[PDB]
Amino acid sequence: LCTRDYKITQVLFPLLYTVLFFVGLITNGLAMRIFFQIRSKSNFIIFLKNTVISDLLMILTFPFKILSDAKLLRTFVCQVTSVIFYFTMYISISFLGLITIDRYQKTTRPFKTKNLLGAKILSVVIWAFMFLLSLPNMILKSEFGLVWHEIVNYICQVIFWINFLIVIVCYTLITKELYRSYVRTADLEDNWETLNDNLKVIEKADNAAQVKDALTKMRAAALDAQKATPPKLEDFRHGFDILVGQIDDALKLANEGKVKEAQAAAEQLKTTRNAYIQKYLRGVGKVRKKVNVKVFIIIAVFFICFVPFHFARIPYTLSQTRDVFDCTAENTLFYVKESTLWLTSLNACLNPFIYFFLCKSFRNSLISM
Ligand SMILES: CCOC(=O)c1cc(C#N)c(N2CCC(C(=O)NS(=O)(=O)Cc3ccccc3)CC2)nc1C
Ligand SMILES: CC(C)CCC[C@@H](C)[C@H]1CC[C@H]2[C@@H]3CC=C4C[C@@H](O)CC[C@]4(C)[C@H]3CC[C@]12C
Ligand SMILES: CC(C)CCC[C@@H](C)[C@H]1CC[C@H]2[C@@H]3CC=C4C[C@@H](O)CC[C@]4(C)[C@H]3CC[C@]12C
Numbered sequence: 414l415c416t417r418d419y420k421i422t423q424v425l426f427p428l429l430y431t432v433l434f435f436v437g438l439i440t441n442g443l444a445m446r447i448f449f450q451i452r453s454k455s456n457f458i459i460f461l462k463n464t465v466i467s468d469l470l471m472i473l474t475f476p477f478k479i480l481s482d483a484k485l486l487r488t489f490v491c492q493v494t495s496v497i498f499y500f501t502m503y504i505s506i507s508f509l510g511l512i513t514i515d516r517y518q519k520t521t522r523p524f525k526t527k528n529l530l531g532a533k534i535l536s537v538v539i540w541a542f543m544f545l546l547s548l549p550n551m552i553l554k555s556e557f558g559l560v561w562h563e564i565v566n567y568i569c570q571v572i573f574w575i576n577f578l579i580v581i582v583c584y585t586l587i588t589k590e591l592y593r594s595y596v597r598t599a600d601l602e603d604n605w606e607t608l609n610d611n612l613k614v615i616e617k618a619d620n621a622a623q624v625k626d627a628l629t630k631m632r633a634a635a636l637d638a639q640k641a642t643p644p645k646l647e648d649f650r651h652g653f654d655i656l657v658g659q660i661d662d663a664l665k666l667a668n669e670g671k672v673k674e675a676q677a678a679a680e681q682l683k684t685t686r687n688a689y690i691q692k693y694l695r696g697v698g699k700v701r702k703k704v705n706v707k708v709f710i711i712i713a714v715f716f717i718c719f720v721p722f723h724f725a726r727i728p729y730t731l732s733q734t735r736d737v738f739d740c741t742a743e744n745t746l747f748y749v750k751e752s753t754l755w756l757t758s759l760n761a762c763l764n765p766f767i768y769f770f771l772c773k774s775f776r777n778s779l780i781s782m
Contacts, residue, residue, distance in 0.1 A: 415740045417747065427483035429755055430475045433762055437472040440765040441465055447768075447778045456532040457519075460511045461772065463536050464764050467504040471761040474498040493551055498758075500547040503569050505760055506719055507539045510576035512767070513711055517583040520590065520708065524701035573723045577715075584712045587703070594702045601641045601698050605691075607634040615679045621667055624675050628664045631679075635660055642698035649697050652690045656682065710770050718760040722753035 445465050453459045477494040481487075519526075546568060549561050611627040611634075618624050639653040663678035681687060729746060737743060768775045 415743045417744055421748075423483050426751060426755070427479045430479050430482070430758065433755075433758055434472055434475040434479065437468065437475075437761040440762060441468045441472065443779070443782070444765050444768055444775075445469065447775055450778070451774050453529065455515075456528050457512065457515045458772070459529070459532045459536060460508045460515065461768055463539075464505060464508050464512075464767075467501050467508065468761040468764050470497065471501045471505070471758065474501070475758065496547050496550045499569065500543050502719075502757055502760065503572050504539060504543055505764070506573055506576050507543075508536075509711065509715055510579045511535070513576075513580050513583045513715075516708060516711065516771070517587060520587055520703040524703075570723065570726075573719060577720070577723070580712055580715050584709070587708060591702065591705060597641065601638060604634045604638040604641065605695055607631070608638070608691075612679060612682060615663075615676055618672075618676065621670065621672050621675075624667045624672055624679075625664070628660055628667060628675075628679065632657065632660045632664065638694070638698065642694060645697055648690075649694065652694050655690055656687065656694070659687065707770050710767055714760065714763045714767060718756055718763060722757050725749050725753050 448458075448462050448465055451458070453462065474494045474497055477491050478498075481491045546565055549558070550565055553561075608631050611630045614627040615624055618627065635653065635657050639657070642649065642653070644650050659678065659681050663675045663681075666678050667675035682691070729749075737746075769779065770776070
């Protein structure tokens with residue numbers, strides 16, 4: 414009844430899925446070849462191995478979509494394959510949530526460092542549960558089928574929204590740890606450059622007020638650096654007392670009056686011994702964190718692919734009284750659903766990027782080929 418442009422409906426979208434089909438088949442194709450050679454020594458490799466299977470199963474659905482949309486039983490095959498598609502996308506969402514938890518657990522653990530049987534069972538449970546809830550939607554004109562369809566769709570939304578929350582919480586806790594790590598390093602680097610910059614002010618100063626003020630900044634910066642530099646586990650305690658001592662010595666001289674003596678007492682921080690102490694103390698406090706541009710690839714893939722579809726569904730699932738009648742609203746619903754479903758399908762082409770940037774043995778094998 415409602416008509417749309419064939420150039421978008423039967424040309425653009427079948428070609429848009431054709432790109433994803435070949436791109437997905439070649440990236441996941443060589444991904445399976447790489448994973449078949451390397452052994453599962455962690456939960457991470459196991460969940461990534463399962464993702465390859467769900468991606469390959471996803472790609473195999475696209476020829477049925479491409480052919481149906483370009484207008485080329487025919488209705489039965491594009492009814493079974495659509496069930497296989499939604500089965501395969503809620504499996505990917507499920508494993509991506511597990512990959513997120515695993516990666517977060519490794520950021521909470523020390524840098525560069527029993528669940529292998531458990532991760533295998535958990536993976537079996539995901540696939541078996543999805544297959545079982547997909548099964549009646551496949552073969553099984555009954556009113557049971559209508560209510561079962563609403564049950565399955567409800568279960569699947571709860572799967573997305575639970576994994577969306579796991580992703581938001583894990584990346585909130587990661588950002589928080591990365592922020593506090595960056596702030597600690599920046600403040601400490603600021604402390605040592607404040608100490609060195611105010612030495613230059615003292616060297617070029619005239620009166621006592623200039624000398625007294627610069628030494629006050631220096632003393633506070635030295636004590637802040639000390640606060641941020643606790644004793645090492647193996648002279649870090651003594652070193653700061655020597656440097657703070659000299660600043661206090663130059664300060665008490667600047668308070669008594671003598672400016673040339675205070676400038677020279679401050680210049681003592683430039684002796685080979687006092688410079689070596691400063692260079693050592695800078696090193697002790699310079700102590701590894703998780704890579705920003707790398708870890709955040711999961712949240713980026715999750716948001717690009719699955720977030721638009723499930724967010725767009727909210728207004729269309731609690732507003733219109735049964736159905737809308739205006740053609741301009743029916744067509745905006747068609748393109749919103751079709752465009753977000755394509756973004757969802759792009760997960761099959763974007764997951765090989767997770768293997769590349771987060772698995773070292775995968776990256777080296779692909780580079781060697
Ligand atoms: C485990 C596999 O389970 C399945 O086989 C399975 C699972 C789901 C699910 N979920 C599913 N639905 C079909 C109906 C669709 C929807 O609600 N369309 S809309 O009414 O037009 C609102 C709208 C608007 C914009 C964007 C998106 C949706 C949502 C996906 N179908 C199947 C077959
Ligand atoms: C849907 C309603 C009722 C809210 C329930 C939210 C549940 C399913 C989710 C959302 C965020 C989740 C948590 C996110 C963070 C972690 C840390 C990780 O080391 C283990 C899992 C754990 C502890 C998750 C378990 C389940 C959790 C609490
Ligand atoms: C760069 C990556 C993330 C992929 C880009 C995907 C997005 C931004 C693009 C590519 C193809 C696009 C769609 C192509 C078809 C139409 C029909 C037109 O009448 C309105 C816009 C609409 C509905 C587009 C919206 C945005 C869209 C889904």
